[PDB]
Design a protein around this nucleic acid. Structure first.
Ligand SMILES: [K+]
Ligand SMILES: [K+]
Ligand SMILES: [K+]
Ligand SMILES: [K+]
Ligand SMILES: [K+]
Ligand SMILES: [K+]
Ligand SMILES: [K+]
Ligand SMILES: [K+]
Ligand SMILES: [K+]
Ligand SMILES: [K+]
Ligand SMILES: [K+]
Ligand SMILES: [Mg+2]
Ligand SMILES: [Mg+2]
Length: 1322
RNA sequence: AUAACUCAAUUUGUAAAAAAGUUUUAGAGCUAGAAAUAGCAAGUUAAAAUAAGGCUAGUCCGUUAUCAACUUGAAAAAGUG
DNA sequence: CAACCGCATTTTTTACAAATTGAGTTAT
DNA sequence: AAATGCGATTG
């Protein structure tokens, strides 16, 4: 009966309201179930559901993949030990047993406590000879004497267990030996090519300074310092930078207008270098060759700090170096500290809590914190200089297992492994027989395109089996079908053709697909000359000409190229106008030219008989990215081109998929024509019909063939694109609407109004680092920053703009930001954009020019080049750039302005439209005699601006900190305003409801900018106007608004004290506990990490999280007698024990000690369960041992508006000064509330005192802080707050005893239905 | 409002990998003195676990989504004022 | 007991698909 | 990245 629903959808809330034809919210009586006094209770139909945020699947994913990593590493070790098992059984009966029981205490061990050899003397001997595992590694690599099998194992297992990364393909083979001759060779060739001016080797110690432990940049700087008359930006400088691993740019050297940047580790190096050499002349090739030849002996200089002539183990040897220098410098540091500051020796070398050397080795101090702690001790001392030198290089007292070993490629560890196996296979036959297996254990790696090696029980797996063997690293290629697996990896994610749903989409770089795009764009190009009377299409012949002559010879085709190279040359038109394209064609035959460069056979690419082949090739190049498998897939075409061409095709790789199928573009045929879609795009006579037209033209049969070709609420919502949080909001919104419908007797509403709320330091620091380094700027060396600092908006913009004004061509001052202006590129009055994309730092905003538009044309002229530099450094995005420059395109036209304004009130967000479609499809389910949908319910969607402006305009002020009522209030107001709008302007249905020259632009602007004026009585537009007291619609005359009564109605609704705020109860899920592993200590609070690892002996976890609490009434044994005592208490069931408890609850509880459990009184109490006690005082159950505040403080509207105005028109100021007494009154309110439900006496006293101490402060400040006070009374978890400078610590409630005798309240989603249980009765 | 294309930014979801960290144990502490307690010597490494665990036993799975109460259901979700 | 103070696994790389937003060309 | 449920210290 005559009601509409208002809905405010948030990430943590859904406000809901029900309104009647005159904007009142009903008040109904609802039955109360349970064993309580109340049989019913009256409720207003307004409220809000609150809930914790929905989470992404990310954390779960990281955990799952980490899991798989651990189990596979374990299996690696197991494979190794299975190889060693028998021959180790002849040396040491129990070696592996001692290894796998090493973690146990002596009390629990089966065997002697010394793992390696099993006796004290031999193990002390071992650790004396090999203080680190790398000593053993190196000796086992270099030495030729037979070694103990157990040590061999320890070496191999250490290398397999920490095998390094896989970011470099192929193999490395360290050769640091000829860096001097290689540098001299580069200098040599360069001097051959530049006979005119040579560089002189000059005994420059290239080895020392390139293999130095600095960064590539500094090594460059220093190295080119030693070369006279040469600059780091010159040719040889850029070359050196290349040999180092940096990406330089060579265009300024070769007078090139096109960027030429080369990175020797990028897989595109061969073709970028071929590009460049084809531009500059191949006589330069031997230069870049030298760059590689050096780059190879120098690649790994940062890990291998040792001559490769002394060892085959440069890694283990460099680690031994770490150890020895650590030793020497430790002895020295000790001596020094003894001499000069002995009183500080203890703190440094004993106290583990201080971050000294003791804290460094035995405490929890990191190398960084240790260096930071001991830096002043060193530079203060004497005899220390080299230790500071080692400190700034981060090389002082290094361990061997360190955060920075992530640079080690697996090829190194593989080198040493191969070496050891080669040494000791001479003595152990089985090592020879199993050399390859072992190397494979270190080598093998499941390809990402295979996924888990599942067998029907992984929801995540997709791989397929060529055979039903158990899969090992040695039978992987024979048992796993890698081709089918790599196929499914992509085809399980790729879209099908929506027009032909049983057809797969073509590769985006398919030749056919690009012909389709080129022709689909070209077929709507029109042209005019002087003679003709109308613009005409291109004919089939003309299109084939434009394609064969321009598109198949130029990578990109410009309009100029079309006017000069076709129209002028082939049609003798000195002038012509082009209508269907701007500047240059968007589509292009990129793949045609890629394959032209590789295949060098244009007639092959033009031959239609090869179409299929070529498609299949580009499919392959797209589907797979493992070059080995691409080769396998291209073999069948190995006869069509020479070997080298096959070599180059291998490396050609494409990514991406289109939107349409091959059948669609060139498969389906028109019955009448016999022509495919592409046939029509190529030639369609006088009508040059589009893909869109072809697919919808009833004279052609494509559409009918397509139509011929053509689930639950929760899956549907989960399938949407968007934040899982807002999705949680959406589902909850649908369930709310369902309940309200039921509340209204299953009558559906007249309208449903929905509003959706809109909407990091490391990312920033990275942005600036890469953009600055690309920009060749020093501002980072000049002004060092730290991640967190860049949360400052103005500092971030300062760095994004290279410390420069964005509208003027002058520098900025880091020390003067407070004096500068942040300015919106397109002003805020049109685009409500707060992000960096629309903001700029400038000395003063006025120098942008006009305030009503894009930055003026002067500015564009003066700063355009600089903005381009920022774009190419990615320090601004394309959006920001185009917006900045729009004044050279007339800036903001009037139409664009009207556009922005209606975009401010009309919701265009896709996810919101999905919400509206869900609701519409749930509410409107019937079809009229003509099979058209009957739209009984109208779903309106509004942007936040309407209700916000409404609140400001009519002083229905909002303060979100006082309580949660504002969610509900917003929902109510959305219902009111939405229904009023649609009642007043029914045509605007098309704009706001779901379902199916320049002067007019100004009219739209003014119109949408004044749409909300039918609410006011007098309006000033910036002359005055006036409006009646009663607002109707003209055509119907129906009353839409009545300013005599309706505003007062709103005030009555906002003032209502009882508003149904419901915190959603939720079983907690996720981690069993905190992840930290604490040391052993006596406490039942420590949870075993494994069944048999008693934490009193081994330590364990703390803080398990309660999945849900349970009410238990039973008896407990008491004292030695074990006399049974009746109890009623709350037992937290932890996530880890939940499944056990649900399997059999009586056995679970009995094991916990409870006897004679009354099974029918067991009550599941998830987090946030609601309980009432005493004077309406409420608590929410956050845990089994802690409670949260459960009450809302309904502050009178007059105080809400007062606080709003005081915290921030002469009349309203007068109101503040006239009603200052409200302050004291407000506090009275709070005080009462607290003394009645918060029960935090001390904290309340500190509030009263701290306030009385600030009754002489400005009223603005006092109000702003009274607002702070409300977190003392807020619903939910207690929290700390500052009144002024008086920090009030939180007073939380950690008992939950009272709850057991309170009234439990089971709430509906709306809270309107309640079941109340008097727990006193149990 | 839809569809294809261009350029760009963002978000979601997935797989394969790396390095640390932590926790027990092993790296014979030494002299004094009865005892705590002093004095000095040392330290850098390794094994193993890294959600307890599960059955489907895979080199798989185990932290997302979804959840008032009562009656019905496996479950979804229905029926109840 | 209540007030009070402390604590919480971290980081790095590769490969891939789909939406969505927002500036453009063409169409239903 | 908080903040909020818990651990332990203390008063
Ligand atoms: K024993
Ligand atoms: K120089
Ligand atoms: K440490
Ligand atoms: K370590
Ligand atoms: K264009
Ligand atoms: K590919
Ligand atoms: K061939
Ligand atoms: K959950
Ligand atoms: K959670
Ligand atoms: K991503
Ligand atoms: K509920
Ligand atoms: Mg495990
Ligand atoms: Mg470790």
């Amino acid at each position: 009966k005559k009601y509409s629903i208002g809905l405010a959808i948030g990430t943590n809330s859904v406000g809901w309201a029900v309104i009647t034809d005159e904007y009142k919210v009903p008040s109904k009586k609802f039955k109360v179930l349970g064993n309580t006094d109340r049989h019913s209770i009256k409720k207003n139909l307004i409220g809000a559901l609150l809930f914790d945020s929905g989470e992404t699947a990310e954390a779960t994913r990281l955990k799952r993949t980490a899991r798989r990593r651990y189990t596979r590493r374990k299996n690696r070790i197991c494979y190794l030990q299975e190889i060693f098992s028998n021959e180790m059984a002849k040396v040491d009966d129990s070696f592996f047993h001692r290894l796998e029981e090493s973690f146990l205490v002596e009390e629990d061990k089966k065997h002697e406590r010394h793992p390696i050899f099993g006796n004290i003397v031999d193990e002390v001997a071992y650790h004396e000879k090999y203080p680190t595992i790398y000593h053993l590694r190196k000796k086992l690599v270099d030495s030729t004497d037979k070694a103990d099998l157990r040590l061999i194992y320890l070496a191999l297992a250490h290398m397999i267990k920490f095998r390094g990364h896989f970011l470099i393909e192929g193999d490395l083979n360290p050769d640091n030996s000829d860096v001097d001759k290689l540098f001299i060779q580069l200098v040599q060739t360069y001097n051959q090519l530049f006979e005119e001016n040579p560089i002189n080797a000059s005994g420059v110690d290239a080895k020392a300074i390139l293999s130095a432990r600095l960064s590539k940049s500094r090594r460059l700087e220093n190295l080119i310092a030693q070369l006279p008359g040469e600059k780091k930006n010159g040719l040889f400088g850029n070359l050196i930078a290349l040999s180092l691993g940096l990406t330089p740019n060579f265009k300024s050297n070769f007078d090139l207008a096109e960027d030429a940047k080369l990175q020797l580790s990028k897989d595109t190096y061969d073709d970028d270098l071929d590009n460049l050499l084809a531009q500059i002349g191949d006589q330069y090739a031997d230069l870049f060759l030298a760059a590689k030849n050096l780059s190879d002996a120098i690649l790994l200089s940062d890990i291998l700090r040792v001559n490769t002539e002394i060892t085959k183990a440069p890694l283990s040897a460099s680690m031994i170096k770490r150890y020895d220098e650590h030793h020497q410098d430790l002895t020295l540091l000790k001596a020094l500290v003894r001499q000069q500051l002995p009183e500080k020796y203890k703190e440094i070398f004993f106290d583990q809590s201080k971050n000294g050397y003791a804290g460094y080795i035995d405490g929890g101090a990191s190398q960084e914190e240790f260096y930071k702690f001991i830096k002043p001790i060193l530079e203060k001392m004497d005899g220390t200089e080299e230790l500071l030198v080692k400190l700034n290089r981060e090389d002082l007292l290094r361990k061997q297992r360190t955060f920075d070993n992530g640079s080690i490629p697996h090829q190194i560890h593989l080198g040493e492994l191969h070496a050891i196996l080669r040494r000791q296979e001479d003595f152990y036959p089985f090592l020879k027989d199993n050399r390859e297996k072992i190397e494979k254990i270190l080598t093998f790696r499941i390809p990402y395109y295979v996924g888990p090696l599942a067998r029907g029980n992984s929801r995540f797996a997709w791989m397929t089996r060529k055979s039903e063997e158990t899969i090992t690293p040695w039978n992987f290629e024979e048992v796993v079908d890698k081709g089918a697996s790599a196929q499914s990896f992509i085809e399980r994610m790729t879209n099908f053709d929506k027009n032909l749903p049983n057809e797969k989409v073509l590769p985006k770089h398919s030749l056919l697909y690009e012909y389709f795009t080129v022709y689909n764009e070209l077929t709507k190009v029109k042209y005019v000359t002087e003679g003709m009377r109308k613009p005409a299409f291109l004919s089939g012949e003309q299109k084939k000409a434009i394609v064969d002559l321009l598109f198949k010879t130029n990578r990109k085709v410009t309009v100029k190229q079309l006017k000069e190279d076709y129209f002028k040359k082939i049609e003798c038109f000195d002038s012509v106008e082009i209508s269907g394209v701007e500047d240059r064609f968007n589509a292009s035959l990129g793949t045609y030219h890629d394959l032209l460069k590789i295949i060098k056979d244009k007639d092959f690419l033009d031959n239609e008989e090869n179409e299929d082949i070529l498609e299949d090739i580009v499919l392959t190049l797209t589907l797979f990215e493992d070059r080995e498998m691409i080769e396998e897939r291209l073999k069948t075409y190995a006869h069509l081109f020479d070997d080298k061409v096959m070599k180059q095709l291998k490396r050609r790789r494409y990514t991406g998929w289109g939107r349409l199928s091959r059948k669609l573009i060139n498969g389906i045929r028109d019955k009448q024509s016999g022509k495919t879609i592409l046939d029509f795009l190529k030639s369609d006579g006088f009508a040059n019909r589009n893909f869109m037209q072809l697919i919808h033209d009833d004279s052609l049969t494509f559409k009918e063939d397509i139509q011929k070709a053509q689930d639950s609420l929760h899956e549907h919502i989960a399938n949407l694109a968007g934040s899982p949080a807002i999705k949680k909001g959406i589902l909850q919104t649908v369930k709310v609407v369902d309940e309200l419908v039921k509340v209204m007797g299953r009558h559906k509403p007249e309208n449903i109004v929905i509003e959706m709320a809109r909407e990091n330091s490391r990312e920033r620091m990275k942005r600036i680092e890469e953009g600055i380094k690309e920009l060749g700027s020093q501002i980072l060396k000049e002004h060092p920053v730290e991640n967190t600092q860049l949360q400052n908006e103005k500092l971030y913009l300062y760095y994004l703009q290279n410390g420069r004004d964005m509208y003027v061509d002058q520098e900025l001052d880091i020390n003067r930001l407070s004096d500068y202006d942040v300015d919106a590129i397109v002003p805020q009055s049109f685009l409500k954009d707060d992000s960096i994309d629309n903001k700029v730092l400038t000395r003063s905003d006025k120098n942008r020019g006009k305030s009503d538009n894009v930055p003026s044309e002067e500015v564009v002229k003066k700063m355009k080049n600089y903005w381009r530099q920022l774009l190419n450094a990615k320090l601004i995005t394309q959006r920001k750039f185009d917006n900045l420059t729009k004044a050279e395109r007339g800036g903001l036209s009037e139409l664009d302005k009207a556009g922005f304004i209606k975009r401010q009130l009309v919701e265009t967000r896709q996810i919101t439209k999905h919400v509206a479609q869900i609701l519409d499809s749930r509410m409107n389910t019937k079809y009229d005699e003509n099979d058209k949908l009957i739209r009984e319910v109208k779903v309106i969607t509004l942007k936040s601006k309407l209700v916000s402006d409404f609140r400001k305009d009519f002083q229905f002020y909002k303060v979100r900190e006082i309580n949660n009522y504002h969610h509900a209030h917003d929902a109510y107001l959305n219902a009111v305003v939405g229904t009023a709008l649609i009642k007043k302007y029914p045509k605007l249905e098309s704009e706001f409801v779901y379902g199916d020259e320049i002067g007019k632009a100004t009219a739209k602007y003014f119109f949408y900018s004044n749409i909300m004026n039918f609410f006011k009585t007098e309006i000033t537009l910036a002359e005055i106007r006036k409006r009646p007291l009663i607002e109707t619609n003209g055509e119907t005359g129906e009353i839409v608004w009545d300013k005599g009564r309706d505003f007062a109605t709103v005030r009555k609704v906002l003032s209502m004290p009882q508003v149904n705020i419901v915190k959603k109860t939720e079983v907690q899920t996720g981690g069993f506990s905190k992840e930290s592993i604490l040391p052993k200590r006596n406490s039942d609070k420590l949870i075993a990490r494994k069944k048999d690892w008693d934490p009193k002996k081994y330590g364990g976890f703390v803080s398990p999280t309660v999945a849900y609490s349970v009410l238990v009434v039973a008896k407990v044994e008491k004292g030695k007698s074990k006399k049974l005592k009746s109890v009623k208490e709350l037992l937290g069931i932890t996530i880890m024990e939940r499944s056990s408890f649900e399997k059999n609850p009586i056995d679970f509880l009995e094991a916990k000690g409870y006897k004679e459990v009354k099974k029918d009184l067991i009550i599941k109490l998830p987090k946030y369960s609601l309980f009432e006690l005493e004077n309406g005082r409420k608590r929410m159950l956050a845990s089994a041992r802690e409670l949260q505040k459960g009450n809302e403080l309904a502050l009178p509207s007059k105080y809400v508006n007062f606080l709003y105005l005081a915290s921030h028109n002469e009349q309203k100021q007068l109101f503040v000064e006239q009603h200052k007494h409200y302050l004291d009154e407000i506090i009275e309110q709070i005080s009462e509330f607290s003394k009645r439900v918060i029960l935090a006496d001390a904290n309340l006293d500190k509030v009263l005192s701290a306030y009385n101490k600030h009754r002489d402060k400005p009223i603005r400040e006092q109000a702003e802080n009274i607002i702070h006070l409300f977190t003392l009374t807020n619903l939910g978890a207690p929290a700390a707050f500052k009144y002024f400078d008086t920090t009030i610590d939180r007073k939380e409630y950690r008992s939950t005893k009272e709850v057991l005798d309170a009234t439990l309240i089971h709430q509906s989603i709306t809270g309107l239905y309640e079941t109340r249980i008097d727990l006193s009765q149990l």
